[PDB]
Amino acid sequence: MDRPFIFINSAMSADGKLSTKERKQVKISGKLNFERMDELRAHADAIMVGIGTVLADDPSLTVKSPERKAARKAAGKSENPVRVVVDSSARTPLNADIFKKGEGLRIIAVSNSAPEEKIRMLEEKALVIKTGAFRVDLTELAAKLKEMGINSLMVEGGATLNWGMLSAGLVDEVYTFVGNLIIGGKTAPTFTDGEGFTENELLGLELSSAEKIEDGILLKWKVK
Amino acid sequence: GSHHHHHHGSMDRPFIFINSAMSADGKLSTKERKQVKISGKLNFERMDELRAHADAIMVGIGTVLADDPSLTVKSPERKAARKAAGKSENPVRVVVDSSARTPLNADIFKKGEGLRIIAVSNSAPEEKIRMLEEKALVIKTGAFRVDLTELAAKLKEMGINSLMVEGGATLNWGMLSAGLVDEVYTFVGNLIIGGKTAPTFTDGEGFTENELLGLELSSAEKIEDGILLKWKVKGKKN
Ligand SMILES: NC(=O)c1ccc[n+]([C@@H]2O[C@H](COP(=O)([O-])OP(=O)(O)OC[C@H]3O[C@@H](n4cnc5c(N)ncnc54)[C@H](OP(=O)(O)O)[C@@H]3O)[C@@H](O)[C@H]2O)c1
Ligand SMILES: NC(=O)c1ccc[n+]([C@@H]2O[C@H](COP(=O)([O-])OP(=O)(O)OC[C@H]3O[C@@H](n4cnc5c(N)ncnc54)[C@H](OP(=O)(O)O)[C@@H]3O)[C@@H](O)[C@H]2O)c1
Secondary structure, three states: OOOOOEEEEEEEEOOOOOOOOOOOOOOOOOHHHHHHHHHHHHHOOOEEEEEEEHHHHOOOOOOOOHHHHHHHHHHOOOOOOEEEOOOOOOOOOOHHHHHHHHOEEEEEEOOOOOHHHHHHHHHHEEEEEEOOOOOOOHHHHHHHHOOOOOEEEEEEHHHHHHHHHHHHHOOEEEEEEEEEEEEOOOOOEOOOOOOOOOOOOEEEEEEEEEEEEOOOOEEEEEOO | OOOOOOOOOOOOOOOEEEEEEOOOOOOOOOOOOOOOOOOHHHHHHHHHHHHHHEEEEEEEHHHHHHHHOOOOOOOOOHHHHHHHHOOOOOOOEEEEEOOOOOOOOOOOHOOOOOOOEEEEEOOOOOHHHHHHOOOEEEOOOOOOOOOOOHHHHHHEEEEEEOEEEEOOOHHHHHHHHHOOOOOEEEEOOOOOOOOOOOOEEOOHHHHHHHHHEEEEEEEEEEEEEEEEEEEEEEEEEE
């Protein structure tokens, strides 16, 4: 029933895009936003992304700063928080950078439809948690993560995973770094894609703060 | 920045600004293209003040078909002041409508005084153009899509020095990708709409990495439950 505190942290263009229409990564934020993001990763118990992000960008999801890594190690944690990939069909690449870089637990959340041959390969490098039929049951995942010690879960995104989490009612707060650019594109991934809310189910927020950082602005929203 | 900031005395085109309201996730309406409550009374008053000071308001055919807006100034005081200063009660109303689909009973024709312009492409059906010419000036420009650069020149030439683009996702793209926009104002509302198919603040084709349009944040101002961001367009980041 219970779950971690859950927050989304992403960087988007002034027009709401996470990457181009080609699904390519571009420069949205500068060094100061990257330092803020590294502070969040250091204090989070776990970081989560979707399979889409893993296949597109192959991110390591590591804490970068030696001092943050040491501070975590000093308090008895792994240098990196737990790293979780949401991945229905067990397609996380075996040579993904998440497995190559750094210490810490990796968790692949898969669906019960996932092929067992792919799951066994993945289990060599990670804990595999199975939920749902053809897609991951994010509520059940969130309960299992909470059970195993995670009280703080940072969702860094994916346009579709952000939708999954917000529409399941699992999210406490939304952090959006808004960068000084227009990306454009009907098919460019946005801060929240997926199915979308109809007019009678819009998710209300409350603006907690707005802080200029370098050339953009960090908006923090509490979810209602 | 590389972008040359136009003003009311620039000879090629009007000063051009986009004013929209979007969700926290960048959407202008639902996946069903349904208009929802993004902003409140205070942003609506700011919006109405801006309309009053524009020479012309431009919207896409998609907005006309979805929302059937009048694009009128609402405050009787604003309208009176425009009239007292020798202007039309409402700014000029312009619809970007490649195939001449603007409905003959659209609200822009039923409500208020002033000039109406429908900008159409040369592929628009001749008979549809002729029927709209009963109710408006029709400007034919572009082969299969409206040429927005040429349209802006034509507007300047008629004496329009300030052009408010209320937008629509696709028109916002047309204007920004042609490098026609001086400033971008987005009221960011306190909601998530979501949806891969929901119209965003800028749709269309989209920029590649080498075409990204740079901005400069002029201001951020909290208003009721949301936040107004104003951006100066700085030009291509290359
Ligand atoms: N600027 C930024 O801050 C930032 C951060 C991260 C990513 N991005 C960008 O966003 C894009 C990737 O986003 P994306 O939407 O393609 O992928 P994504 O959100 O990373 O992952 C979504 C995928 O997760 C899987 N999933 C499994 N169970 C799910 C559930 N219950 N709800 C939702 N998803 C579930 C689904 O695929 P299966 O069903 O096949 O498992 C789904 O298509 C990339 O272009 C990346 O660069 C940007
Ligand atoms: N929240 C807000 O402040 C706000 C403001 C405005 C609109 N909206 C919402 O936006 C939603 C949908 O937007 P939309 O993109 O469908 O409508 P739109 O941008 O108002 O209309 C776009 C249309 O303009 C026409 N066009 C012709 N030549 C063009 C050119 N060179 N460049 C760009 N466009 C050209 C195209 O259709 P043809 O080629 O067929 O003529 C195009 O589909 C609506 O549901 C509305 O509620 C919200």
